[PDB]
């Protein structure tokens, strides 16, 4: 149960988000849709308390900032340096970095989870490759594997299906269905309006305020899309 209460995010004397208030129930795969640059991506960052915000967000009657261990954030692969010297195996192991104490290190339990996460997304033989030596789809699957090892109850992805091949997209979606089957909640910021009823069981339309939110068939409608992409001036 994700619960947002009057969340707002300013930037340059301009509210990019204005009084966001939702109750998201799982298990679910929900799509956050709307115009590019219009607050759908910053909603995830406002929830986590990464950027400054003017409200509260909760996970099962506990504040989101005080319970970050229960949630995993898969950022856009566009703001990761591909030429950083790091292997696929090491990149996936970054998910377990909060779990280890200050003077301890990764035991066999942690490496077994790293091996299994790579095997799920189909990149076990790529474990020793540099991240620079991978396609967009393959690198996205490394980030999904890195997400899996956290063993979180909530998974927030920022445009996971943007600029990837179909084979990679098919694998990534099978992994998110596993997260839904396991009772967990998956909240995807989607990059366009492609395959909305195929991926998502609820949708959340965002231009600045939440213009619509609910079950996909009911809320992914021409009326709601018009005022989102038309800025209530269609």
């Amino acid at each position: 149960m994700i619960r947002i209460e009057n969340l707002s995010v300013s930037y340059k004397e301009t509210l990019a988000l204005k009084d966001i208030s939702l109750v998201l129930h799982g298990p679910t795969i929900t799509g956050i849709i709307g115009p590019n640059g219009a607050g759908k991506s910053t909603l995830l960052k406002g929830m986590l308390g990464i950027i400054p915000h003017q409200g509260q967000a909760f996970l099962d009657d506990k504040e989101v900032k005080k319970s970050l261990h229960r949630i995993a954030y898969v950022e856009q692969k566009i703001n990761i340096d591909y030429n950083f010297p790091i292997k696929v195996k090491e990149c996936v192991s970054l998910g377990l970095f909060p779990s280890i104490p200050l003077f301890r290190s990764l035991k066999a339990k942690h490496w077994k989870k790293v091996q299994e996460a790579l095997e799920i997304v189909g990149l076990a033989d790529y474990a020793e490759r540099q991240i620079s030596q991978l396609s967009g789809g393959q690198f996205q699957r490394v980030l999904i594997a890195r997400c899996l090892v956290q063993e979180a109850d909530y998974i927030l992805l920022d445009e996971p299906f943007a600029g990837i091949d179909s084979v990679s997209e098919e694998i990534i979606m099978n992994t998110l269905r596993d997260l839904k089957k396991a009772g967990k909640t998956v909240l995807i910021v989607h990059h366009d309006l492609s395959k909305i009823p195929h991926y998502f069981d609820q949708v959340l339309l965002v231009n600045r305020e939440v213009i619509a939110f609910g079950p996909t068939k009911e809320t992914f409608t021409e009326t709601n899309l018009k005022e989102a992409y038309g800025n209530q001036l269609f």
């Epitope: 339990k109 989870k113 596993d178 089957k181």
Partner: antibody
């Protein structure tokens, strides 16, 4: 719908061999740990074999030596070869997405409909 | 082996009331703060259906009326409120050590 379907069950005399198959739809077996679990006529669930994604198989001592679990990646079929079948092997044999260390896959979360095996003369 | 015995083996509960099923184990089912304990439901005809995995993690499709708890060797499966559709046999199971073992069985009768 994600679905597993077993086949190849039937009658075998004591000492005979039989090979069970498991077809998939929506799952690629190579990516997950896969297992076979049996249910006796007295409703006792017993695990009989598993195969990890890497290829490492492992079995219980009660079934070791006789049963061997394999997997065809290209056709995407999981098999269970049985040999020298004893009378205690009479059971409903299930195909299931087996146990793993990661939180979400710690149980048998998918189960096929089940193909039955009788071992009698 | 890790042997596990459920208690009780047969149970009768009326509608809207608490059902409770135990699963004691010979050895630890948890490993280093990670539970590998799992609960299943089996209605006749169909296979066993994963109900709850680890200690308390609820699989989707199963309503929140079901719940799991406990640690180490002692574990519990609660159902409240109990409804007509919950008539089935219930198994515990561990994925911590070889062989992967199941419980004996617990039949749930709904009163009428």
């Amino acid at each position: 719908e994600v679905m597993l379907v077993e086949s190849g069950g039937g009658l075998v005399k004591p000492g005979g061999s039989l090979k069970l198959s498991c077809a998939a739809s929506g799952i690629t077996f190579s990516s997950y740990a896969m297992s076979w679990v049996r249910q006796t006529p007295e409703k006792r669930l017993e695990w009989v074999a598993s195969i990890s994604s890497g290829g490492s198989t492992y079995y219980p001592d009660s079934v070791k030596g006789r049963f061997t679990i394999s997997r065809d990646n290209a056709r995407n079929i999981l098999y269970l070869q049985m040999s020298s079948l004893r009378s205690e092997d009479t059971a409903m044999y299930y195909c299931a997405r087996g146990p793993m260390a990661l939180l979400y896959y710690r149980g048998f979360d998918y189960w096929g409909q089940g193909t039955t095996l009788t071992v009698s003369s | 082996d890790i042997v596990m015995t459920q208690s009780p083996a047969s149970l009768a509960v009326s509608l809207g009331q608490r059902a409770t099923i135990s699963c004691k184990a010979s050895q630890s089912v948890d490993y280093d703060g990670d539970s590998y304990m799992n609960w299943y439901q089996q209605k006749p005809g169909q296979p066993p259906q994963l109900l709850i995995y680890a200690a308390s993690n609820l699989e989707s499709g199963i309503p929140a009326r079901f719940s799991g708890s406990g640690s180490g060797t002692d574990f519990t499966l609660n159902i409240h409120p109990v409804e007509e559709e919950d008539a089935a046999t219930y198994y515990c199971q561990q994925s911590n050590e070889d062989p992967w073992t199941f419980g004996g069985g617990t039949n749930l009768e709904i009163k009428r």
